[PDB]
Amino acid sequence: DPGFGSLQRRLLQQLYGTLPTDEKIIFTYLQDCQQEIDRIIKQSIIQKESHSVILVGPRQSYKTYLLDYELSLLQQSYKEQFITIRLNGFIHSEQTAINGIATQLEQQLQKIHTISSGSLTEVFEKILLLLDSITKITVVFIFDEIDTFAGPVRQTLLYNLFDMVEHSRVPVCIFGCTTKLNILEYLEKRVKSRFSQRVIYMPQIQNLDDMVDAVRNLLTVRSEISPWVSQWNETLEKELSDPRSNLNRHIRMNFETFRSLPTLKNSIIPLVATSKNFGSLCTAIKSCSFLDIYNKNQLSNNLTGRLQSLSDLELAILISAARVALRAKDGSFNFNLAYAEYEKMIKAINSRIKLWLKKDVKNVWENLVQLDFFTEKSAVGLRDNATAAFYASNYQFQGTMIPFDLRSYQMQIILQELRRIIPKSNMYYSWTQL
Amino acid sequence: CLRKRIIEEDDQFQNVAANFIHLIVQAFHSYTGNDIFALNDLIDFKWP
């Protein structure tokens, strides 16, 4: 069935958004923001007016998608009118962004028709000579994660960028993107004064009909590139119009928990791709049993699923450690006290099962630390940045120089949570109460 | 080691190997948990 292959491929690239530009899908709740971004970028590229605007919205809220759609829209009709410089706040640092701007400037100006050669002082003053200072070429700056350059110490790059926006003869468009709602408070006073205070907040999903209409936009094939298109559109419209269908129930569950269309797309894609024929795809979209299987797999390495993989000695040691941590006031325990509780519990069970020695319980203890059931007391864990991690790697911690049986640990799961989802018919269930 | 002791004293050989593996699992699953590598180590130490 090559027609099913064509329909499956079309549905898959609609779900990945990799359509041609004229066929790109804009959701109805995203349309006002898309028009506002289109007006700003058209006033920059067509009409040579300088602009400064920060896009504020959560992750996966189509900030990059709308900007890329607008730039590819103006790419096909005004190609020689503008160049694009892309900076990302994670990849680029305050010194490295100068070199990135210079290298993108030379490779973008060689694409239409050196600036990037020398030390950092020379490169920066050459960029300033080009920008600080027929039609003029617009320079569009796309600044992702712009909050990292609005720091508390100094904001040199944002100062010079907004100075180029407000006081230069080359027209420049600067788009910032961030997740921080209070991005204007991050800005220094002179940087905020040079900024235009134009902040666009990305639209959120307000009602369930927005999610259903977006799913309808994603899964309806609007071109007749397969013979199965009409039946697929009919069955999809039948499932979406029915309020009691399984797909509507999954959309409602997403609206109540995640409220994220990329989250739903990540489940819809293997439902579409794992089907082998047209009727199998129709049964899959009518039942959505694969969505249940996917949801079960997404939770299988959580705290609930990791406990169900434990052995009887592992579960007994974990219960004993949770008992010792509950009785403690700092919630702290070690291997010796947990082994004392374990041997007490085994004696009171066999008085009313093999007792293992401390040498063999050492391995189960190490596995429980490895599976993130226990953690070291007041441990910071993974550091935020490379500098603090580098500082931590050059320090010898006091919990790594004492013997293992005296190291203080704290529970990632408490005894009440242990009682909740260990089954009532289990052997050690009675000792989850204290 | 196995063939050297058969000489010095094919489904049957698979039977005794699988029975050894099941005995190792039944003796040390509470010790190893579901660690494949720990049971591989115990099999390699206790086979000869």
Ligand SMILES: Nc1ncnc2c1ncn2[C@@H]1O[C@H](COP(=O)(O)OP(=O)(O)OP(=O)(O)O)[C@@H](O)[C@H]1O
């Ligand atoms: N150029 C693109 N073409 C097609 N789909 C894209 C493109 N850029 C992003 N997407 C898709 O858009 C969805 C999320 O939007 P996007 O990546 O724009 O989020 P964002 O709000 O800019 O994110 P962040 O704050 O993390 O940078 C995802 O499904 C992603 O795959």
Ligand SMILES: [Mg+2]
């Ligand atoms: Mg982005």
